[PDB]
């Protein structure tokens, strides 16, 4: 009754997991995501670039397990928008998740179901902690890739419809030459 | 409702999370852990070395949160035995842990409740999963610090005692130049 231990070999250069299977998000994946629906287009139709590629160790579904995956978010924009993550909620309200930020520059912007928001600048050795209850989505704001480790409970799930939906209240930008954190116009509530 | 997000900084070189209070531990703090008593009462009295410190980083114990924490052990020897950590199981039987390797050679000594053991070498990038009701013990077997980082449970807690009084039924030595992992003359069960 006692589960086998093991050790994986993880590339904190390429955020590549030996053994684990690569799942790609590409641009057509991502419908409805970004605020320039027109740039969505054309940027799919001309490249439909890869936008992240996740590699995760995962447990089955239990109370106290633990799984871990890496993201490699690629870099580019969407019009203004950076390349981000969909972003979800866990489907438990009391699940929290460790971010390891391994390469790169990105950040996550977080908020809860009323839409009070937050962002965390990540570089190489920031750690971040994501509580209870808050959706999650990271940003790649560089021009090469950003690269990190997420460790989370075998049992938080995913909610991506909430924010598939809604979207975040926050965007995150490029004017000027510099990066801005500034209020999604889609955003209701 | 909800508990602010942040974000740490972790240096990946050292082991030292910003803001976070070393927690040193001397070999005096370790009596009745190593073998050769004789050689654990000499490097006392004649040095009473660190054999490791840790920076963590933890939330009030409840159900569904994380903690994380580095620790830095540090390169020796207690006659054969390398220098490890006092190991422990969880004071929970259902709470599993993921550590990843940053700096140096190491490995970690699991063990079941009924003796049952399983050791996981460890280099920078290894990720190693700690199931549920495993006690785990770190070791270095190299001549530079080794380094991880551990994310766990909030609520798994600790039971050091049932190490503390029986020990692992493995150990961890140096025999001409290699590094073995053999039986413990001291361990019953
Ligand atoms: O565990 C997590 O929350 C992360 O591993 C994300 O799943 C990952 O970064 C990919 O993002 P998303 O799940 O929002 O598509
Ligand atoms: O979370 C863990 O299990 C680790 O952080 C260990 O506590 C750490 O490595 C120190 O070892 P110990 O707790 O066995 O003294
Ligand atoms: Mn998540
Ligand atoms: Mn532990």
Known sequence: ?????????????????????????????????????????????????????????????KEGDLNFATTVLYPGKVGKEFFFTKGHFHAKLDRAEVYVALKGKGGMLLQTPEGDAKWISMEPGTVVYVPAGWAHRTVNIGDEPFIFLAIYPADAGHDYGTIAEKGFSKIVIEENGEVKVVDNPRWKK
Not at 1 to 13: A, I, L, S, T
């Open 1 to 61: 009754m006692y589960k086998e231990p093991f050790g994986v070999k993880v590339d904190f250069e390429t955020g590549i997991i030996e053994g684990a299977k690569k799942s790609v998000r590409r641009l057509s994946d991502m419908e409805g995501y970004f605020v320039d629906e027109r740039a969505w287009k054309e940027l799919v139709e001309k490249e439909d670039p890869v936008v992240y590629e996740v590699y995760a160790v995962e447990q089955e579904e």
